[PDB]
Design a protein around this ligand. Sequence first.
Ligand code: RV3
Length: 167
Amino acid sequence: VNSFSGYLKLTDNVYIKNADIVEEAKKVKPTVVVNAANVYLKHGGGVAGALNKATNNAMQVESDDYIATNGPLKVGGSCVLSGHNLAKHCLHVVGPNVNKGEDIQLLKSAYENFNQHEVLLAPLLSAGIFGADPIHSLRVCVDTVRTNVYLAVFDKNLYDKLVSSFL
Ligand SMILES: O=C(NCc1c(C(=O)O)[nH]c2ccccc12)c1ccc2[nH]cnc2c1
């Protein structure tokens, strides 16, 4: 038993809700919140900009130190950093950005990072400003992640299309 509320159960291990991941993160304090990161951990917009703002820019400060030490992530890769006031940990995961021409097949590799964590609150990778089809992203998520994933979908209209079209 865990503290996530109001989710619709899609599969054995995947759950979905219409929620603001920032507000869901502040209420659950999950062990892991997933950020929709880029390779530079520059948290300017989308989910990353929203999570970072909610940390009063502490996520960005920590991220800049991480990059200065380690260099950029790989597309499809991840790193674990602090969750600040939102979670114990933040798993920064880089899905491919279609608006940069990145190979969509890397979306499966990105979701594989979730399997290193028993339970996660997460957005749909490569959705939103990353330019992928969220329905495709949901299918890859379901077919790749084996751990328990609670997907927060900000847009109510999108949440309805994802549910109604889910196979
Ligand atoms: O961009 C936001 N959500 C869209 C999105 C999804 C999704 O919802 O499936 N997946 C993504 C992956 C990368 C980038 C963006 C997305 C977002 C979320 C909460 C906010 N709170 C204030 N602004 C906000 C913006």
